[PDB]
Design a protein around this ligand. Structure first.
Ligand SMILES: *[C@@H]1O[C@H](CO)[C@@H](O[C@@H]2O[C@H](CO)[C@@H](O[C@H]3O[C@H](CO[C@H]4O[C@H](CO)[C@@H](O)[C@H](O)[C@@H]4O)[C@@H](O)[C@H](O[C@H]4O[C@H](CO)[C@@H](O)[C@H](O)[C@@H]4O)[C@@H]3O)[C@H](O)[C@H]2NC(C)=O)[C@H](O)[C@H]1NC(C)=O
Ligand SMILES: *[C@@H]1O[C@H](CO)[C@@H](O[C@@H]2O[C@H](CO)[C@@H](O[C@H]3O[C@H](CO)[C@@H](O)[C@H](O)[C@@H]3O)[C@H](O)[C@H]2NC(C)=O)[C@H](O)[C@H]1NC(C)=O
Lengths: 56, 177
């Protein structure tokens, strides 16, 4: 995509009441938005080319 | 098949008996007719129904594939994941197919058994008060009306009550007509 540079992303799960500490000096790509895990349960990531069908 | 009754010494079934799997055809002066044996038919239905439910139920827990993804240097565990998941599909497929085949045999032989046993219920009731014809039928040595027919079909046939009439007939038969 026209770039010879590379971007490398990382992640962690930050428990409630815990904190995450960044320090940097360059080349940092900082967080803006993050995700609360609001509810957990059974799901899956299906691989399908299809789109939504209005059904149950 | 194994018991030699269905499509054996009784050759072919009755298109005109609709209210059961096994039963009777009777024939006397007052006519003819078909009649299911309710009790054997119900036991058969009970039997096959429990069997099918038991098959469904035992296959209830059984391997359920899950998608897992792997990167370009996890080719070995990606393969081990694939073969493993395939490994179970094959086992269960074998289990299902072979179960169907073995139980179909059992089911078909089950029915054969039910008909033999029904014939034999009649046989050991009548004894020499009737003549075994060899084709699934009995020919009485005495008159057996619609009421008497019902007694046979439901276990109530009284042998001593007709035994006298039977021995008298056998004597005429011996003279040759
Ligand atoms: C991310 O933020 C969270 C919220 O801001 C932080 O949670 C907090 O943890 C700290 C410990 O690091 C707690 O500090 C004090 O804990 C108790 C006081 O108890 C309080 O909470 C109780 C809840 O059960 C109440 O029942 C109490 O009445 C009271 O309100 C004390 O043991 C300490 O006070 C004493 O000690 C310190 C020295 O450590 C002195 O400086 C004080 O003056 C005093 O002498 C703790 O300070 C804090 O209570 C807690 N916050 C909440 C809302 O529960 C979390 O730690 C933070 N994460 C990181 C990684 O920093
Ligand atoms: C199995 O079926 C048999 C045939 O129905 C039945 O036997 C019958 O029972 C009674 C005996 O008391 C009689 O039924 C009635 O029939 C006529 C109707 O026209 C009446 O006029 C009679 O007086 C009589 O009360 C039948 O005669 C009798 N049949 C025979 C062949 O014995 C059995 O009871 C049934 N078995 C069971 C366990 O119930």
């Amino acid at each position: 995509n026209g770039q010879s540079g590379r971007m490398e992303f990382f992640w962690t799960i930050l428990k409630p009441n815990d904190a995450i500490n960044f320090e940097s000096n360059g080349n940092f790509i900082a967080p803006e938005y993050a995700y609360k895990i609001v509810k957990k349960g059974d799901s899956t990531i299906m691989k399908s080319e299809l789109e939504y069908g209005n059904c149950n | 098949g194994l018991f030699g009754a269905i499509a054996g010494f009784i050759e072919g079934g009755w298109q005109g008996m609709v209210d059961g799997w096994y039963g009777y055809h009777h024939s006397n002066e007052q006519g003819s007719g078909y009649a299911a044996d309710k009790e054997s038919t119900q036991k058969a239905i009970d039997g096959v129904t429990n069997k099918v439910n038991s098959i469904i139920d035992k296959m209830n827990t059984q391997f359920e594939a899950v998608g897992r993804e792997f990167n370009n240097l996890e080719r070995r565990i990606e393969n081990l994941n694939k073969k493993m998941e395939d490994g179970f599909l094959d086992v269960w497929t074998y289990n299902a197919e072979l179960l169907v085949l073995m139980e179909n045999e059992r089911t078909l032989d089950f029915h054969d058994s039910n008909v033999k046993n029904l014939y034999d219920k009649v046989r050991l009731q009548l004894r020499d008060n009737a003549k075994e014809l060899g084709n699934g039928c009995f020919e009485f040595y005495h008159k057996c009306d619609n009421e008497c027919m019902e007694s046979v079909r439901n276990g109530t046939y009284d042998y001593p009550q007709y035994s006298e009439e039977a021995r008298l007939k056998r004597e005429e038969i011996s003279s040759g007509r």
